[PDB]
């Protein structure tokens, strides 16, 4: 860049300099390690770890650390990293995207920053697209890591949960984006801490950042699980409840509770052939379903809270009664209603846990990535992952010839030209590589070759292994390979025998894909390390690409000017029109994803509280403090309900409140009216709470001292998991359900936030309350064992784009 | 907060602790400065500056620095900052928003962090809403700053550009948001560096951050200037050009240039009674208008580049000829076209420079703010200005009584109740404060009092001075003040004589404004420092607030249930419905602004290059390097045009190119064909460029050695200003013009970016080219003096929200 406009490349210029300087300092001390014993070298790692355990930091040991690795690699592999490669690693160490054109040795370069970061033993995941690339890579680069004395673990979805913990224990872990992700998810559904495979997320080096952070990040990671046909239960509950309907079946107003601690119910409910008094392993399922049936009958009313329709039981916004979108009542209350209205009780598969690759890779303490095509989306990376794509120089100047797109009028008449180009180069002995975007493309162009008499090999994505070795031999003399959508990406083709004299590897594009990155990856599959090559792109006016840009007015001026006569056309202005459009597509996609995150950022805020909070229980010793805090919190909300905003100071329905505390937290007639006569609301809390401690000390004294510590963990876990899971599916219902009925001035996202959080607060209070009750009014039976709220099989999948 | 949900206030909890600790350390050493001589204390500043000039940093000297100020204030003002106030300052020093309820002494607190940051003498602006608050503040707090030995300057729009430089030279500068902003703008329109009032932006302490960063930031700062009826010029140009139309009037194709360096034109153009050969002070105006008229005739065609309509001359997107929105041809080319088509030649007022308060206050190296209501928009602050609102504790626990809104059916029947409340408290001797949102409110409620016989004072925003002193006496016995939209905000009312016994200051809300912050500011105007008070809000079903939420379905259930009988109503669920709606309004506003910035962020990127680049010329000594780089850059683009993408290697229209170089950069017949016969395109550059140096050394040798250094600065300045100004107005045309015709999948913002940048590149190349020419083919005349491209009067204003 020359002229005023050059100032743009200024921020990325000062950076590339530091890295160029550093690359020299690393090359300076190349003598200190050049002539040394393998053991003395390996012992360098220990010196580094020690210095780090003392003041030193990663940056301090950067030049030296890089030196060691640069050398170590020469010994293990016949390769000694170039200044550019050293520059790349630093970039990566900085937390940026290091864009380095294919054939620059990205893989090896990845070891410099991975090594330096793996010294504190905090861990370093090196994510990749498929299982194969990760295996291969960890096997070859592992040698350099291990040699210098580092543990390198591999992670696959085949590996038992045990085999995993192992790989995540390693100094450096290789894996795929999908695996890493699901593990995170499954790790938060764990019952006992030791079931978790992952360690705290440290540093992530994403190889092929675009494919991973951008492409495969268009949809979220979903873990679901259908219902075990639990329809027969809801009906029963609905039926029974209709029986006993006596005033001796409490349901105070201000509380909005349908308490059933009375004998008339406590006993008659057991007459439904239950395992009798056993109110623990049975107090969950049956009791949970019976309270909802009781609430759906005594609290909810056919035409004041919900609206029954030929579809389902739709809710109604209290203020200005508006029909709720894809909203539902939590904890199966929606079910109790459908049963009460006899309407179809919808039993579907729920979404247990979810997260976006965006919010996922953002958890790591530091992130970084490498790829060939990164500038195209440069604006997004910096946006979502606060990473600046640093365009790393090339070892040798490029000499590959990039020819201007050749336009064609007829689609089929286009491919007939492509087949020719391929054919004529084949005879010269030049290795050709035609890339396509669709299967029919590689298919129909393959038959053109079979009828023309030219040997070739199709590259449909069936098995990464096979393609890998087939691509390598794509630079030989009679080489003619038809690649579809970057078949074996990651493996660069090295020019065959003296193929350089015969020109070079000439790549042929049968059409340009939406994102430039894609046809740029194809384009760069030639000319690695100054090699000679030519890149040709064939475009016809019939390409779906054209028809989506609205190029009809240009199609006319083309035919209206007997232009379609001149078969090949190289219109500079039409090529720009094409790219200018790809940019539009890329922009929209960037929106879809930018939107996706925004919606998940609502869940993220929530997951943060639940996941962190859950973890505490799973990994705790004295759960009392946590529990008590949940009990006292549940209590206050109760005290606050019977003592509203100064509504007649000492003239509150005090008599009714004490009735509730005796039916919820403390036993019957344990709290006398006089106890709460002439005391502020705050006063009351400390007061009746101190009576909870009494019944608590007794609960822990009458029962086992430490078996109680388990009672707490079992209850709180089940409480949390019960709700959270129902909430997540509910949040997923809401997110897509809103898209239907909505016209208000406020955007849909605002609603999702406001309604979503409000739903969250309900679950928190419901958890706090459920948690408190069981602790105070439930007894231990046959055995106390944490149970999995998830029933049946679980599925780990990611939605296809749509 | 109690229970699981408490974990949310965790991030803001660890922060408030550091600040509580620090506040103690600052209180620890209160003895070191307690008993000391004024001089010894003042000498502390010097010790600090010295320590800073050596290793020490602001954080290091924080506890000590705060100590000094805390003490210094006690001496100057009878006040000694509380721990909370010390905590606030630290927050501010951190770069956060310190939210501290009215009456917490925000002003004084502002000195702790302002002082500490003003030690390196880099400057510190303390922005405020109006001129008065800034004066007052700088006068009272200045004393503490000056005392400790610091220069405190005030900035007003009345102050001459000279008086300004002074205020911005000060150690600490007080000012208003609007002033600061315009100064920045005007500072970049400066001809000679020394005309600039501002210094590099350092630290900004925004008092009333919400009002400034959020409220008054709903629109941009615009500086415009209409045209001096320069219509008679365009017509003439259009007319003349039609005359000479001989092939001896060059206009090559590939170049797309309408060069008029031939004698047939060079002379006949002068026959239009020009000041003759004078091609310098005249070579700008007349020549610029004549080339556009020549281009609008030889390059543009009635129905292939533009479309003439009863409106104007609309452009047409080349590929798939689409009618351009509010786009226009730059450099008055659009004019040459309207003249050529005789169509109305639109002469309007242009927008010279613009910026958003968002992008403005983001320039400062560090930013921070203080206010009472900040949590409401907490999500936005962190978003746009990366600031976390830290909710600072109160010196004393609050005891003000916040009563639930009282709902009314009839609007007028509501106010009749308000007047009563006001009246009954007046008799008791309690000072009342009724706030309104509209003038008619305070108006009509004022007559209710005049007819009832109660003394009061209206507070329409006429003069900040007056209201200030009227508000102070709003806490006395027979005090009854009617405030409208926070009249004298910034001035807290101190309870009158023993007024505390008579209850306290009871504030009355005649309606709740859209944003809660607003009715929260009103609400907090009572109870400062544990004072006793009551806050009452009156809402009626007729309030415009209700009618915009769609509360009709609730209006019915209210009347359909003979509810309107019970005049006052305190529905907990209806109050929530109200706030839940205010939140919606606030969300939308947050969008309008979030959108505003996004559009300006396109300009920001551009301003960055031009402004920075311009500044270089204004403040440079050896402009050659800059110029040459602009000439060589302009040259390359030319060489690249005649030598397209490998289109017949040595078979380029070489003969025509040399013709252009001789008509643009070098003189006639200076470059021979043989010179460019068998040389790569890169080869050519270095080649014909070396001949530019020759004619350059000669231009600088034949003419003055250093008067040339002025020739460069004059030309480049005029070149830059010519275009930039036209571009800015063009960008402003485009931004609002797009909103009309647009349906494509891509959002409007994407278009603005893509088209906007493309427009930018044109101006850069046009500048680079214009700059190069004049330097090589223009001569010095009567005098060489930088001229202001701006003609007539200039206006500095900000659009009202709409």
DSSP state of A347: -
Judgement on whether residues A340 and A355 belong to the same structural domain of the protein? no
Find the residue in B nearest to A627 (Cα): B3
Q: Which residues, including other chains, have CB under 8 Å from residue B427's CB and lie 6 or more apart?
A: none
Q: Does A629 touch chain B (CB under 8 A)?
A: yes
CB interface of A with B, residues 285-324, below 8 Å: 318-322
B589, B523 contact by CB (below 8 A): no
Task: Flag whether B356 is marked binding.
Answer: no
Instruction: Let me know: does A347 contact A227? Beta carbons within 8 Å.
Output: yes
Strand order in the sheet with B350-355: B350-355, B221-225, B795-797
Among B113, B105, B116, CA closest to B81? B105
Give the integer Cα–Cα distance in Å for A662 and A641: 16
Q: Report how far residue A628's alpha carbon sits from residue A694's, in angstroms, rounded to the nearest whole number.
A: 12
Q: Which residue from A minimizes the CA distance to B1?
A: A633
> Of the candidates B73, B43, B75, B49, which has an alpha carbon nearest to the alpha carbon of residue B61?
B49
**Cβ atoms < 10 Å from Cβ of A695:** 16
Angle at B259 between CA B257 and CA B261, to 5 degrees: 165
Token pair listed for B458: 């209206």
User: Any chain A CB within 8 A of the CB of B754?
Assistant: yes
- As a whole number of angstroms, the distance between CA B507 and CA B525 comes to 8
Resolution, given in Å to one decimal, reads: 3.3
B629 to chain A, minimum CA–CA distance in Å? 6
- At B583 the three-state DSSP class reads helix
Considering only the beta carbons, identify the residue of B322, B551, B745 that sits closest to A320: B551
Is A560 at the interface with chain B, CB within 8 A? no
Residues B443, B490, single domain; the answer is yes
Spatial neighbors of A801 by CB under 8 A, at least 6 apart, are A218, A219
How many C-beta atoms surround the C-beta of residue A520 within 10 A? 18
H-helix or E-strand containing A417?
helix A411-428
Nearest CA to B259 out of B638, B670, B630 is that of B638
What does the CA dihedral A112, A114, A115, A118 come to, rounded to 10 degrees?
A: 160
* Rounded Cα distance, B551 and B577, in Å: 9
Q: How far apart are CA A645 and CA B576, in angstroms?
A: 14
Please count the residues of chain A.
802
In this complex, the residue of B4, B551, B632 whose CB is nearest that of residue A764 is B4
The two counts, helices (H) then strands (E), for chain A are 28, 19
DSSP H or E stretch at residue B768: helix B748-777
* Closest CA of chain A from B233, distance in Å: 31
Cβ atoms of residues B134 and B465 within 8 Å: no
> Is A104 labeled as ligand-binding?
yes
SS (H, E, C) B320-371: CCCECCCCCCCCCHHHHHHHHCCCCCCCCCEEEEEECHHHHHCCCCEEEEEE
User: Please, which residues bridge with residue A371 across strands?
Assistant: A99
Nearest to residue B89, comparing CAs of B68, B66, B73, B67?
B66
In eight-state DSSP terms, residue B693 is H
CA pair distance A466, A472, nearest whole angstrom: 11
- On whether both A143 and A284 belong to a single domain, the answer is no
Does A633 contact B2 at a Cβ distance shorter than 8 Å?
Answer: yes
The minimum CA-CA distance between A550 and chain B, rounded to whole Å, is 7
H-only helix segments in A200-230: 209
B27 and B161 part of one domain: yes
- Which residues in chain B touch residue A612, judged by CB atoms under 8 angstroms apart? 7
Do B4 and A613 lie within an 8 Å CB cutoff? yes
Q: Which residues contact B648 (CB under 8 A, 6 or more apart)?
A: none
Residues A561 and A675 reside in one and the same domain: no
Contact partners, residue A247, CB within 8 Å, separation at least 6 = none
CATH of the domain at A612: 1.10.3060.10
**CA A394-A397-A400 angle, 5° bins:** 110
Distances (CA, A) of B128 to B138, B464, B489, B736, B754: 11, 13, 11, 31, 37
DSSP string, A356-376: -HHHHHTSSSEEEEEES--GG
> Helix or strand or coil: residue A31?
helix
Residue A799 CB: number of other CB atoms within 10 A? Answer: 10
Chain B partners within 8 Å of A318 (Cβ): 573, 577
Which DSSP category does B9 fall into? Answer: G
Residue B758 contacts by C-beta under 8 Å, 6 or more apart in sequence?
A: none
Which uninterrupted H or E stretch holds B764? helix B748-777
In this complex, is the C-beta atom of A630 within 8 Å of any C-beta atom belonging to chain B?
yes
Cα A638 from Cα A654, distance rounded (Å): 12
DSSP 8-class letter at A669:
T
Judging by DSSP bridges, how do beta strands A97-99 and A432-436 pair with one another? Answer: unpaired
- CB of B525 closer than 8 Å to CB of B398: no
Query: What CATH number should be reported for the domain holding residue B366?
Result: 3.40.50.300
Report the DSSP pairing between strands B306-308 and B313-315. Answer: antiparallel
What is the nearest CA distance from B306 to chain A, expressed in angstroms?
Answer: 16
Q: Which residue in B has a C-alpha nearest to residue A605's C-alpha?
A: B8
Domain stop point among B676, B705, B734: B705
The answer to whether the beta carbons of residues A763 and A330 sit under 8 Å apart is yes
| Dihedral sign of CA atoms A156, A160, A164, A166 in order | negative
Task: Specify the CATH number for the domain of residue B249.
Answer: 3.90.1440.10
Technique used: X-ray
B350, β-bridge pairs = B225
Same domain, B338 and B364: no
> DSSP letter string over A671-723?
S-GGGGSS--HHHHHHHHHHHHHHHHHHHHHHS-TTTHHHHHHHHHHHHHHHH
Residue A702 neighbours by CB under 8 Å, 6+ apart = none
CB contact under 8 A, B4 and A768: yes
Same domain? B20 vs B159: yes
CATH code of the domain in which B649 resides: 1.10.1200.230
3-state secondary structure (DSSP) of residue B802? coil
Between the alpha carbon of residue B553 and those of residues A316, B546, B547, the distances in Å are 12, 11, 11
- The owner of tokens 């080649």 is B687
Helix (H) or strand (E) holding B153: strand B152-154
**Total domains, chain A:** 5
Cα–Cα distance between A769 and B605 in angstroms, integer? 54
Q: How many helices (H) and strands (E) does chain B have?
A: 28, 19
Residue whose pair of structure tokens reads 């493996």 in the numeric block: A491
Q: Extract long-range pairs of B149-158: CB within 8 Å, 24+ residues apart.
A: B149/B42, B149/B45, B149/B46, B150/B45, B150/B115, B150/B118, B155/B179, B155/B180, B155/B183, B156/B131, B157/B131, B157/B182
- What is the rounded distance in angstroms from the CA atom of residue B693 to the CA atom of residue B307? 44
Residues B444 and A624: their CA atoms lie apart, in Å, by 60
Q: Using alpha carbons, list the distances in angstroms from residue B648 to A468, B654, B657.
A: 39, 11, 15
Least CB-CB distance to A609: which of B5, B644, B745?
B5
Query: How many C-beta neighbours within 10 Å does residue B399 have?
Result: 12
Alpha helices in B395-455 (DSSP H): 411-428, 439-450
Nearest to A554 among B320, B552, B767 (CB): B320
Contact residues, chain B, for A608 at CB < 8 Å: 7
Residue B688 parent element (H or E): helix B681-702
In whole angstroms, give the CA distance from residue A441 to residue A419: 12
Q: Which residues pair with B175 in a beta bridge?
A: B127
- 3-class state of residue B87 by DSSP: helix
Shortest distance between the Cα of A771 and any Cα of chain B, in A, equals 11
Work out whether strand A795-797 and strand A221-225 pair parallel, antiparallel, or are unpaired.
antiparallel
Q: What does the CA dihedral A152, A153, A156, A158 come to, rounded to 10 degrees?
A: 140
Run of H or E including B641: helix B624-642
* Alpha-carbon distance B514 to nearest alpha carbon in chain A (angstroms): 14
Q: List, in sequence order, every residue forming a beta bridge with A368; answer none if it has no partner.
A: A205
- Taking the C-alpha atoms of residue B371 and residue B518, their distance in angstroms, rounded to an integer, is 12
B215 vs A80: CA distance, rounded Å: 60
SS3 per-residue string spanning A419-436: HHHHHHHHHHCCCEEEEE
3-state SS class at A225: strand
Evaluate whether B178 touches B102 at the Cβ level (below 8 Å): no
Same structural domain for residues B221 and B306?
no
The kind and range of the H/E element at A176 are strand A172-176
Q: How far apart are CA A621 and CA A713, in angstroms?
A: 10
Q: Are residues B55 and B4 in the same domain?
A: yes
Handedness of CA B724, B729, B732, B736 (dihedral sign): negative
Q: Is residue B574 classed exposed, middle or buried when 0-12, 13-18 and 19+ CB atoms within 10 A define those classes? A: buried
Q: Out of A683, A705, A727, pick the residue that ends a domain.
A: A705
3-state SS assignment for residue A555: helix
Contact B171, B124 (CB under 8 A): yes
Task: Mark whether B112 and B199 lie in a shared domain.
Answer: yes
Token pair of A689 as six digits: 């709470």
Question: Smallest CA–CA separation between A801 and chain B, in Å?
Answer: 17
Question: CB of B656 within 8 A of CB of B642?
Answer: yes
> CA torsion B77→B78→B81→B85, rounded to 10°?
-70
User: How far are the Cα atoms of B29, B447, B530, B535, B765 from residue B428, in angstroms, in the given order?
Assistant: 48, 21, 21, 17, 77
In the numeric block, the tokens 């397209």 are attached to: B644
d(Cα B464, Cα B491) in Å, to the nearest integer? 10
Q: Are A251 and A298 in contact (CB under 8 A)?
A: yes
Last residue of a domain, one of B348, B378, B405: B348
| B521 annotated ligand-binding residue | no
Q: At what angle do helices A131-147 and A62-76 cross, to 10 degrees?
A: 100
B135 and B468 in contact (C-beta within 8 Å)?
no
Through-space distance between the first and last CA atoms of chain B, rounded to whole angstroms: 40
Q: Which of A112, A132, A135 is nearest to A124 (CA)?
A: A112
Decide: A613 and A716 in contact? Cβ < 8 Å.
no
**Using CA atoms, how far apart are residues B656 and B673, in angstroms rounded to an integer?**
9
A557 Cβ contact partners less than 8 Å away, ≥ 6 residues apart: A563
Separation CA B802–CA B15 (nearest Å):
40
Name B480's bridge partners: B432
Residues of A numbered 639-698 whose beta carbons fall under 8 angstroms of chain B's beta carbons: which are they? Answer: 644-646
DSSP-assigned letters across all residues of A99-153: E--TTS-HHHHHHHHHHHHSTTSS--EEEESSHHHHHHHHHHHHHHHHHTT--EE
A105 annotated as a binding-site residue: yes
For B475, left (φ over 0), alpha (ψ -120 to 50), or beta?
Answer: alpha
Asked if B547 is an interface residue toward chain A (Cβ–Cβ < 8 A), one would say no
Q: With contact defined as beta carbons under 8 Å apart, do A144 and A73 qualify?
A: yes
Under the phi-then-psi rule, with left for phi > 0, alpha for psi from -120 to 50, and beta for the rest, what region is A648?
left
Tokens 């106890």 found at: A675
Q: How far apart are CA A388 and CA A369, in angstroms?
A: 10
Please give the Cα distance from B25 to B20 (Å, whole number): 9
**Rg, Å, chain B Cα set:** 33
Q: Is A106 annotated as a binding residue?
A: yes
A428 is in an annotated binding site: no
- Domain containing residue A334: 227-348
Per CB-CB distance under 8 Å, the chain B contacts of A320 are 549-554, 577
Identify the DSSP state of A264.
Answer: H
Strand segments, DSSP code E, in B158-231 are 172-176, 203-207, 221-225
Q: Which two tokens stand for residue A399?
A: 């000499």
Nearest-Cα distance to chain B for A321, in Å, is: 7
- Same domain for B113 and B185? yes
Q: Which of left, alpha, beta for A71 (phi over 0: left; psi -120 to 50: alpha)?
A: alpha
Which is nearest to B721 in space by CA: B773, B763, B778?
Answer: B763
- The side-by-side arrangement of strands in the sheet containing A97-99 is A152-154, A172-176, A125-128, A203-207, A366-371, A97-99, A389-391
Which residues in A lie closer than 8 A to residue B645 (C-beta atoms)?
A: 403-404, 570, 572
Q: Which residues, in sequence order, are CB contacts of A370 under 8 Å at separation 6+? A: A88, A92, A97, A98, A99, A100, A106, A109, A110, A205, A206, A207, A208, A209
Per the CB < 8 A criterion, the answer to whether B794 and B223 are in contact is yes
Spatial separation of the C-alpha atoms in residues B386 and B379, rounded to whole Å? 10
Determine phi and psi for A402, rounding to 5 degrees.
-100, 105
Dist CA B611 CA B522 (whole Å): 42
Cβ neighbours of residue A157 under 8 Å, at least 6 residues apart? Answer: A131, A178, A179, A182
Task: Report how far residue B249's alpha carbon sits from residue B263's, in angstroms, rounded to the nearest whole number.
Answer: 9
Out of B319, B584, B746, whose CB is closest to A554? B319
Task: Show residues of chain A in contact with B552, CB under 8 Å.
Answer: 320
Tell me the C-alpha distance between B34 and A207, whole Å: 61
Handedness of CA B707, B713, B719, B722 (dihedral sign): negative
Comparing CA positions, the residue from A296, A287, A303, A289 lying closest to residue A334 is A296
- By C-alpha distance, the chain A residue nearest B755 is A580
Distant-in-sequence, close-in-space partners of A540: CB < 8 Å, separation ≥ 6: A407, A408, A409, A410, A411, A413, A414, A511, A546
Q: Are residues B108 and B151 in the same domain?
A: yes
């Amino acid at each position: 860049m020359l002229g005023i406009l050059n100032k743009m490349f200024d921020p990325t210029k000062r950076t590339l300099n530091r890295y160029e300087k550093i690359a020299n300092d690393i090359d300076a001390i190349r003598g200190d390690y050049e002539n040394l014993s393998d053991d003395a070298l390996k012992h360098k790692t220990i010196e580094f770890k020690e210095r780090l355990e003392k003041g030193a930091t990663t940056d301090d040991l950067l030049v030296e650390a890089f030196a060691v690795v640069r050398e170590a690699s020469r010994r293990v592999t016949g390769m000694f990293p170039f200044k550019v490669q050293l520059m790349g690693g630093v970039a990566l160490h900085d937390g940026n995207i290091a864009e380095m054109k294919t054939g620059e040795g990205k893989t090896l370069t990845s070891t410099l920053p991975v090594y330096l970061n793996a010294l504190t033993g905090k861990g370093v995941h090196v994510v990749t697209v498929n299982e194969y690339l990760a295996s291969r890579d960890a096997e070859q680069m592992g040698k350099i890591f291990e040699f210098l004395g580092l543990t390198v673990g591999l992670n696959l979805n085949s590996m038992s949960k045990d085999e995993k913990r192992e790989a995540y224990a390693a100094d450096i872990t290789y894996s795929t984006n999908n695996e890493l992700g699901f593990d995170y998810l499954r790790d938060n559904m764990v019952l006992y801490k030791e079931q978790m495979v992952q360690r705290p997320l440290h540093f992530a080096v994403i190889d092929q950042v675009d494919s991973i952070l951008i492409d495969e990040a268009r949809t979220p990671l979903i873990i679901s699980g259908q219902a075990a046909k639990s329809t027969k239960l809801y009906v029963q509950a609905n039926a029974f409840v209709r029986t006993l309907k006596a005033e001796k079946d409490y349901t105070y107003d201000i509380k909005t509770k349908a308490v059933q601690l009375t004998e008339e119910g406590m006993t008659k409910a057991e007459k439904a052939f239950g395992i009798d008094n056993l109110f623990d392993v049975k107090h969950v399922a049956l009791n949970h379903h019976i309270n909802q049936a009781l609430k759906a009958h005594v609290a909810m009313q056919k035409d004041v809270d919900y609206v029954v329709e030929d579809g389902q039981v739709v809710i109604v916004d209290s203020f200005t009664g508006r029909l709720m979108k894809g909203r539902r009542y939590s904890e199966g209350l929606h079910q109790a209603i459908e049963a009460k209205e006899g309407l179809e009780i919808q039993n579907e598969s729920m979404t247990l846990a979810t997260i976006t690759f965006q919010n996922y890779f953002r958890m790591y303490e530091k992130l970084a990535g490498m790829t060939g095509t990164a500038k195209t989306e440069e604006e997004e990376f910096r946006n979502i992952y606060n990473m600046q794509v640093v365009t790393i120089p090339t070892n040798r100047p490029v000499v590959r010839d990039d020819r201007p797109d050749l336009i064609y009028r007829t689609m089929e008449g286009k491919f007939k030209a492509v087949a020719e180009d391929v054919a004529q180069r084949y005879m010269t002995g030049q290795p050709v590589l035609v890339g396509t975007v669709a299967v029919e493309t590689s298919e129909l162009i393959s038959k053109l070759l079979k009828n023309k008499g030219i040997p070739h090999q199709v590259l449909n994505a069936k098995n990464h292994e096979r393609e890998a070795q087939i691509i390598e031999e794509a630079g030989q003399k009679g080489a003619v390979t038809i690649a579809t959508n970057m078949a074996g990406k990651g493996t660069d083709i090295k020019l065959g025998e003296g193929v350089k004299e015969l020109g070079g590897l000439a790549v042929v594009g049968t059409e340009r894909h939406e994102s430039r990155r894609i046809d740029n990856q194809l384009r760069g599959r030639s000319g690695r390390q100054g090699d000679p090559g030519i890149t040709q792109f064939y475009l016809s006016m019939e390409d779906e690409l054209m028809r989506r840009f609205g190029a009809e007015r240009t199609m006319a001026m083309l035919d209206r000017f007997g232009m379609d006569d001149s078969t090949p056309i190289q219109s500079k202005m039409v090529s720009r029109a094409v790219e200018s459009s790809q940019k539009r597509v890329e922009g929209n996609n960037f929106d879809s994803r930018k939107q996706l995150l925004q919606y998940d950022d609502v869940l993220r805020q929530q997951r943060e509280v639940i996941y962190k909070q859950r973890f505490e229980v799973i990994d705790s010793e004295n759960l009392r403090e946590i529990v008590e805090n949940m009990i006292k919190s549940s209590l206050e909300r109760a005290i606050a309900a019977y003592t509203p905003r100064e509504e007649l100071p000492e003239e509150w329905k005090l008599d009714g409140l004490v009735d509730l505390i005796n039916t919820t937290y403390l036993d019957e007639g344990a709290l006398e009216k006089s106890d709460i006569f002439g005391k502020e609301p705050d006063e009351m809390l400390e007061l009746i709470m101190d009576r909870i401690i009494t019944k608590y000390n007794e609960k822990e004294e009458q029962f086992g001292k430490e078996q109680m510590r388990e009672f707490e963990k079992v209850i709180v876990l089940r409480a949390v998991d019960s709700k959270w899971m129902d909430h997540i599916d509910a949040m997923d219902q809401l997110r897509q359900g809103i898209h239907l009925r909505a016209y208000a001035q406020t955007n849909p996202l605002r609603e999702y936030q406001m309604e979503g959080f409000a739903m969250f607060e309900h679950m928190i209070e419901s958890i706090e309350d459920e948690v408190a009750k069981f602790v105070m009014k439930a007894e231990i039976e046959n055995n106390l064992e944490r149970e999995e709220v998830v029933q049946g099989q679980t599925t780990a999948h990611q939605p296809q784009e749509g």
